[PDB]
Design a protein around this ligand. Structure first.
Ligand SMILES: [Cl-]
Ligand SMILES: [Cl-]
Ligand SMILES: [K+]
Ligand SMILES: [Mg+2]
Ligand SMILES: [Mg+2]
Ligand SMILES: [Mg+2]
Ligand SMILES: [Mg+2]
Ligand SMILES: [Mg+2]
Ligand SMILES: [Mg+2]
Ligand SMILES: [Mg+2]
Ligand SMILES: [Mg+2]
Ligand SMILES: [Mg+2]
Ligand SMILES: [Mg+2]
Ligand SMILES: [Mg+2]
Ligand SMILES: [Mg+2]
Ligand SMILES: [Mg+2]
Ligand SMILES: [Mg+2]
Ligand SMILES: [Mg+2]
Ligand SMILES: [Mg+2]
Ligand SMILES: [Mg+2]
Ligand SMILES: [Mg+2]
Ligand SMILES: [Mg+2]
Ligand SMILES: [Mg+2]
Ligand SMILES: [Mg+2]
Ligand code: NA
Ligand code: NA
Ligand code: NA
Ligand code: NA
Ligand code: NA
Ligand code: NA
Ligand code: NA
Ligand code: NA
Ligand code: NA
Ligand code: NA
Ligand code: NA
Ligand code: NA
Ligand code: NA
Ligand code: NA
Ligand code: NA
Ligand code: NA
Ligand code: NA
Ligand SMILES: [Sr+2]
Ligand SMILES: [Sr+2]
Ligand SMILES: [Sr+2]
Ligand SMILES: [Sr+2]
Ligand SMILES: [Sr+2]
Ligand SMILES: [Sr+2]
Ligand SMILES: [Sr+2]
Ligand SMILES: [Sr+2]
Ligand SMILES: [Sr+2]
Ligand SMILES: [Sr+2]
Ligand SMILES: [Sr+2]
Ligand SMILES: [Sr+2]
Ligand SMILES: [Sr+2]
Ligand SMILES: [Sr+2]
Ligand SMILES: [Sr+2]
Ligand SMILES: [Sr+2]
Ligand SMILES: [Sr+2]
Ligand SMILES: [Sr+2]
Ligand SMILES: [Sr+2]
Ligand SMILES: [Sr+2]
Ligand SMILES: [Sr+2]
Ligand SMILES: [Sr+2]
Ligand SMILES: [Sr+2]
Ligand SMILES: [Sr+2]
Ligand SMILES: [Sr+2]
Ligand SMILES: [Sr+2]
Ligand SMILES: [Sr+2]
Ligand SMILES: [Sr+2]
Ligand SMILES: [Sr+2]
Ligand SMILES: [Sr+2]
Ligand SMILES: [Sr+2]
Ligand SMILES: [Sr+2]
Ligand SMILES: [Sr+2]
Ligand SMILES: [Sr+2]
Lengths: 132, 337, 53
RNA sequence: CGAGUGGCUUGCUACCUCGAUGUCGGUUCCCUCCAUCCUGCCCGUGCAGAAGCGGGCAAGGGUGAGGUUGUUCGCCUAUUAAAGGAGGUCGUGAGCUGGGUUUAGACCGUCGUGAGACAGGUCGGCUGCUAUCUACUGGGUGUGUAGGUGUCUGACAAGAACGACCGUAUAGUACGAGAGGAACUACGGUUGGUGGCCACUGGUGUACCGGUUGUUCGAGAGAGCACGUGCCGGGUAGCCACGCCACACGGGGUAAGAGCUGAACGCAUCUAAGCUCGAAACCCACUUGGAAAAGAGACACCGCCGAGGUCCCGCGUACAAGACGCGGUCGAUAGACUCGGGGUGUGCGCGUCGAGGUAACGAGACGUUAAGCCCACGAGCACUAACAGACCAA
RNA sequence: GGUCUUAAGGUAGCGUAGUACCUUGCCGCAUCAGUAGCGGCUUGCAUGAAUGGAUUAACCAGAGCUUCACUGUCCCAACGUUGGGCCCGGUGAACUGUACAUUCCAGUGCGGAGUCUGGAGACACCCAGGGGGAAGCAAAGACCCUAUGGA
RNA sequence: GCGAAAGCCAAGGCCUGUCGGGAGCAACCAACGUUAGGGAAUUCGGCAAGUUAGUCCCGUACCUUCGGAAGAAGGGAUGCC
RNA sequence: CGUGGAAGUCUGUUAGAGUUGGUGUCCUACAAUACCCUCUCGUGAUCUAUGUGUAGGGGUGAAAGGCCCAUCGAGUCCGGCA
């Protein structure tokens, strides 16, 4: 994929429970897989800010609940390094559900987003109220 | 069927034993292309800081923007090319033919060598030129030594001697180029060989750690779960199968880890200067204050503070040189805190 | 830059930036400041802090 | 239908072991095979393209995470370039585990007159030993080569030190009616592996500083104990990973294959002689080791009454003993002192305030006070200690 | 089949059961995915009424399963603490020992060799290590068969 | 303090749960402390560890043999002067 | 509403009794059954000292073929016995 422009320490793993930052009807998401990732023996497949991940809907409306959808990691508690050396971290771990064309499923994004994610996923960015 | 997995550690840096010389020895030199010149230099590791730079890479979207880069500070005072050793091409490889020495010797070189009192430079030189005529002259290298005395933070005064190759143009021209350098007093500097922005190969003898187990030394796993409580925590599963009935040298075992020679490739020289511009407040921890000829190597450099490191023009660079990088800022913040 | 907590100048190529839930951004110059901030302490009340003094 | 190869399954046999070669599955760590799953290079196509299908060379590297089940096997999910198979006493219990098989207790079903049985099910049910030899990982002492110091050489040896993927431009282009949709090359990044390093972020930090509970030293001050810090907060150096740095290109020779020239065979023919090409594979390149390479090596200087070394002394860039490195007054090697640079967070005492209380008394607030206390780092500094002095040696 | 063996011919219930071979039975719940667990069905290889059936509040170091919470169980390991380990003084065993013994790759041999054969490698001695081999040490195999053995 | 509980301390007893010296004291082992992000992905199985916790106030489901379930659950409070 | 204070009743390392898991430590042990943490019972079919009775095809047994002096699907000693 296109460079993020930031070093990321994946703060999530397969099976992790994160926040679904949007109005799709899905409240809590469960990480199932990480797009384009291949681990090593005994390693839990890791995911971090800027990654496209397969996801499971744990909490939310009956219609959204139990569905297997794709999402993009928008925020993570574990720090990331910016080109100027500074570290950046968020209040929570969040992702936004996405379609086949990488366009946000819902109409509105909740909470802030990373500028690096915004650059990689344009249509997701052009839906963000705040970009840090 | 039990998953595949790369082995623990590399079999390319063995045997993993204590190094013979604390002074690194390059086992390879750069090519003979440009003008005649010394193919290496040396200094003493001081410590680290970070620097702010302007992106030199024309292929980066961040070209022109400020970038924070980690840097190791190395005191690189002038050295002395005390002699010129010539090698001859024999059926059993290269062998030392003769050497051409000098008159001027550093006041404290006798702490290591049995300094020459009666030498014949002319005769040796002739022998070398005769071998050149015969078409048997191998390569030309200079016997060099550092001046630890020039570095306050370094305790030793006993100089560190190391042979450095001279490559460049025609053998005839670099022979003369070498001889001239030696004649004066052999005094040369980092400037003479390197330019900020070039890629160098840094060789050094790693930080010593004495004996360590397979986990640390080879990166093997620790016993997991229930296995970690039975009486085994950091011991490998087994020393090998029933057959072959012997332990293979390839299985991760305990032993000397650290204090080995390493040659780190493609190290960018961020800046070569002189003074106290890079010194940290309160002094570099476990080293001291830098105020003299130094070099700023991008990233890490093998070895502890005070250790002798060697420089050599990158033998296999991946990028094209982006000379004299613009240094917007050099951190002087204390390394304590 | 200045530390949004203690108030001293943040050494360039150092520090962390905490992004609050609402999108607010807080530049910390060190772990010490972040930790005192997490204890619910307010810079003004701490004598060693450049803000207070 | 016919001919075989293998020795992974099963069966057969009864050679070997019954004065015992510890089970299945799993795990961990190492090596290998190729009948190749991916990756490289190729041929064919019912090959437009894209995506496939079949075949050839090829074992360098890779082949991962999870849900049920003790399971092996297998079924299933989502990722993936792909999530290949097999051998090593069905590798691996003087390594681990002990869920299953297969002791002694018990239940159910079936069978039995019964004791009790079951190639049925089920709950419970133990894991010994101080390594002599050999083997390997690392560390020393001697002898050989036959005075010492320093620098080298390179027989050999090891490596995967690098493997793979995504994205951008090429390009909405070639191709195609359209749908759809490549490549060469150049770039950016990711993943796995590898080696190193700690400026940065992170962890530790029973160094240190602070808060504070119970109790004891009469109170105060200041302390001990509460498991090897009472607990809570912060945390330096160092050590670290979750942090940071680095890990080609190119040559040479080939395989499959594509060809040139070319005869046997006037023609034809990539082959028979000859030649041009051509794989992630081979060799070189690169990294690591390596004078014990018995052809036991080379160079330079110093020295054979003296070069040099060991002991000794102060110490670590070193370290389980040994070894290694540096300094030793012609000195900054270690300590003290003082600065600097750091940690904590405002000391004792006194003054004012303080809800109240007649007063006694009073938790606490402010000031004095960026205070007090503390530092595994640096600098200055010969004050103290590196003294005295011994021995080996061509 | 629309009685026959042998007296009767399975009623209430419960049921893929700690009983169900087929079997991971089928449907549903739950999960990304559930040979598990629960509910329903149930023709039950071979359930069933003091050989007691069903059912059940309370109780349980009893067997199985699910959720919240928590966490170094794991991703993936690091640093530290105390006692050992290592070096020195003193004290001072045991296991084990046909012999020889520096081995490695192959082969051969009673078909599982440090000692045979062919090669390869190999200067001696010592310190520390984790245990690959000595079909390692410890026990005249509990398994199985045999004995005109025992209980 | 509820207490013959913990923890601390007397009286009384003891330094004889009877070998020492040394090395920031390595690997490895026994006990154990702390670990960022994730949070059972580990494993036959949360085995091991951890989480919770004392007291008062509020409040409390199915079921039930009416005893119980029940400290259900959940929420609030807690010092000193 | 109070009084009352029942219970093979609850919590409880009170004393005391017991022994679930760690398949930890040990396994030429401290020990021929030990150590630590964890865990169960703790007014009763309770625990415990001393005294006393039951004896080997016999006792004793809330039954495990458990126990009867480290000895039990028939104790131990000596004899039959070479
Ligand atoms: Cl393990
Ligand atoms: Cl996955
Ligand atoms: K046998
Ligand atoms: Mg695994
Ligand atoms: Mg620092
Ligand atoms: Mg800082
Ligand atoms: Mg054996
Ligand atoms: Mg083949
Ligand atoms: Mg291979
Ligand atoms: Mg086996
Ligand atoms: Mg074994
Ligand atoms: Mg065993
Ligand atoms: Mg053992
Ligand atoms: Mg079982
Ligand atoms: Mg069982
Ligand atoms: Mg069912
Ligand atoms: Mg009846
Ligand atoms: Mg026998
Ligand atoms: Mg039998
Ligand atoms: Mg009989
Ligand atoms: Mg954690
Ligand atoms: Mg698993
Ligand atoms: Mg437990
Ligand atoms: Mg009695
Ligand atoms: Na053990
Ligand atoms: Na065959
Ligand atoms: Na096994
Ligand atoms: Na291969
Ligand atoms: Na499975
Ligand atoms: Na075997
Ligand atoms: Na075995
Ligand atoms: Na075992
Ligand atoms: Na096993
Ligand atoms: Na080639
Ligand atoms: Na019946
Ligand atoms: Na009971
Ligand atoms: Na831990
Ligand atoms: Na062994
Ligand atoms: Na009453
Ligand atoms: Na116990
Ligand atoms: Na008897
Ligand atoms: Sr060299
Ligand atoms: Sr070399
Ligand atoms: Sr065990
Ligand atoms: Sr063998
Ligand atoms: Sr082949
Ligand atoms: Sr292929
Ligand atoms: Sr099998
Ligand atoms: Sr099956
Ligand atoms: Sr295997
Ligand atoms: Sr078992
Ligand atoms: Sr039984
Ligand atoms: Sr059976
Ligand atoms: Sr079974
Ligand atoms: Sr493209
Ligand atoms: Sr289109
Ligand atoms: Sr204490
Ligand atoms: Sr050919
Ligand atoms: Sr020699
Ligand atoms: Sr019926
Ligand atoms: Sr032989
Ligand atoms: Sr040992
Ligand atoms: Sr007393
Ligand atoms: Sr004594
Ligand atoms: Sr702490
Ligand atoms: Sr689990
Ligand atoms: Sr699981
Ligand atoms: Sr509460
Ligand atoms: Sr009771
Ligand atoms: Sr058990
Ligand atoms: Sr013990
Ligand atoms: Sr035992
Ligand atoms: Sr424990
Ligand atoms: Sr109780
Ligand atoms: Sr007798």
């Amino acid at each position: 994929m296109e460079a993020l422009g930031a070093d990321v320490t994946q703060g999530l793993e397969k099976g992790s429970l994160i926040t679904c930052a949007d109005n799709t009807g899905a409240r809590e998401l469960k990480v199932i897989s990480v797009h384009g990732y291949s681990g090593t023996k005994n390693r839990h497949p890791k995911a971090g800010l800027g990654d496209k991940i397969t996801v499971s809907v744990t909490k939310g409306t009956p219609e959204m609940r139990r569905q297997v959808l794709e999402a993009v990691v928008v925020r993570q508690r574990k720090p990331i390094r910016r080109p100027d050396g500074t570290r950046v971290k968020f209040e929570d771990n969040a992702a936004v559900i996405v379609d086949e064309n990488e366009d946000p499923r819902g109409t509105e994004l909740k909470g802030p987003i990373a500028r690096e994610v915004a650059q990689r996923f344009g249509s997701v960015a052009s839906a963000a109220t705040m970009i840090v | 069927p039990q998953p595949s997995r790369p082995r623990k550690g590399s079999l390319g840096f063995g045997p993993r034993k204590r190094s013979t010389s604390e002074t690194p020895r390059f086992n390879s030199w750069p090519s003979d292309d440009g003008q005649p010149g010394v193919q290496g230099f040396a200094g003493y590791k001081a410590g680290m800081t970070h620097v702010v730079l302007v992106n030199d890479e024309p292929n980066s979207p961040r070209e022109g923007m400020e970038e924070t880069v980690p840097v190791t500070v190395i005191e690189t005072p002038p050295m002395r090319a005390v002699a010129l050793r010539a090698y001859e091409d024999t059926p059993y490889g290269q062998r030392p033919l003769t050497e051409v020495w000098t008159d001027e010797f550093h006041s404290e070189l006798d702490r290591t060598l049995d300094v020459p009192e009666d030498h014949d430079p002319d005769a040796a030189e002739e022998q070398i030129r005769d071998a050149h005529e015969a078409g048997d002259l191998g390569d030309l290298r200079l016997i060099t030594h550092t001046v630890p005395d020039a570095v306050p933070s370094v305790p030793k005064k006993k100089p560190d001697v190391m042979e450095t190759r001279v490559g460049g143009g025609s053998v005839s021209d670099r022979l003369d180029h070498a001889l001239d350098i030696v004649e004066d007093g052999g005094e040369h500097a980092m400037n003479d060989i390197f330019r900020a922005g070039e890629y160098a190969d840094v060789a050094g003898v790693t930080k010593g750690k004495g004996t360590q187990g397979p986990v640390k030394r080879w990166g093997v796993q620790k016993r997991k779960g229930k296995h970690a409580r039975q009486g085994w925590r950091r011991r490998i599963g087994n020393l090998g199968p029933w057959n072959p009935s012997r332990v293979r040298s390839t299985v991760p075992q305990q032993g000397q880890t650290g204090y080995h020679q390493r040659t780190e490739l493609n190290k960018r020289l961020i800046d070569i200067g002189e003074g106290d511009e890079p010194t940290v407040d309160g002094g570099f921890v476990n080293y001291g204050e830098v105020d003299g000829p130094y070099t700023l190597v991008k990233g890490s450099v093998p070895g502890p503070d005070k250790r002798l490191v060697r420089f050599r023009p990158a033998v296999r660079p991946n990028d094209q040189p982006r000379l004299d990088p613009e240094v917007r800022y050099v951190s002087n913040e204390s390394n304590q805190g | 830059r200045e530390c949004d907590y203690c108030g001293t100048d943040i050494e360039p190529g150092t520090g962390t930036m905490f992004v609050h839930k609402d999108g607010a951004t807080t530049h910390f110059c060190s772990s010490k400041c972040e930790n005192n901030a997490d204890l619910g302490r307010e810079a003004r009340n701490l004598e060693w802090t450049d803000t207070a003094r």
